[PDB]
Amino acid sequence: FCYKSRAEAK
Amino acid sequence: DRGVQMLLTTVGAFAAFSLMTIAVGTDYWLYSRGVCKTKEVMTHSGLWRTCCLEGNFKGLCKQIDHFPDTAEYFLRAVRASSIFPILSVILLFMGGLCIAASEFYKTRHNIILSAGIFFVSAGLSNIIGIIVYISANASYSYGWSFYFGALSFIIAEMVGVLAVHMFIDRHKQLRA
């Protein structure tokens, strides 16, 4: 979840 | 309703924290036959002190003699402290703080999920604690504090489910 959250920023 | 869901979650959390704290502090866990104070009568035998009952002298309590086999040494140590019950209590407290911060400093949407994870983890800690305690005590009936602990586990899991569902609803509203 944390990985997807950070990537969604871009 | 969102209001009812939030209130039910808050009430449940307070109740679970209170139940576990009372249980980890009270002495009516086992109900065994042992020595009130030495240097074999019915007893209270909680998590920390084994008070005596029905004996020539009642009300006397002595700290249970933990440590009267490294495999057994480690179990004895984990039971000596109540790292698992105590950790359950701490986790429940942190969950409560998260739910409280939900109303203020809101719109973060991730503090509700935090509360859910904390409640579920507290439950897992409570179950490990129960297994360790039961294994260390290897008639012997269990008292109302042990069952308070169990009720804490069930309530905590339910409050966790409410938190997760609430977080999901928040992210569903946000995506619309």
Binding site: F1, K4, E8 | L113, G116, I117, V120, G123, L124, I127, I130, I131, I134, A150, F153, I154, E157, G160, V161, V164, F167, I168, H171, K172, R175
Partner: protein, 32 residues
């Protein structure tokens, strides 16, 4: 055949496994 405590902990574990399977499989918004 199984002690009383084993049944009690089987029930507690069932509740736990179910709650955790619900959480991991459904909390992340990226799964909708």
């Amino acid at each position: 055949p199984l002690a009383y405590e084993i049944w009690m902990c089987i029930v507690f574990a069932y509740i736990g496994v179910s709650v955790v399977l619900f959480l991991v499989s459904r909390f992340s918004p990226y799964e909708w």
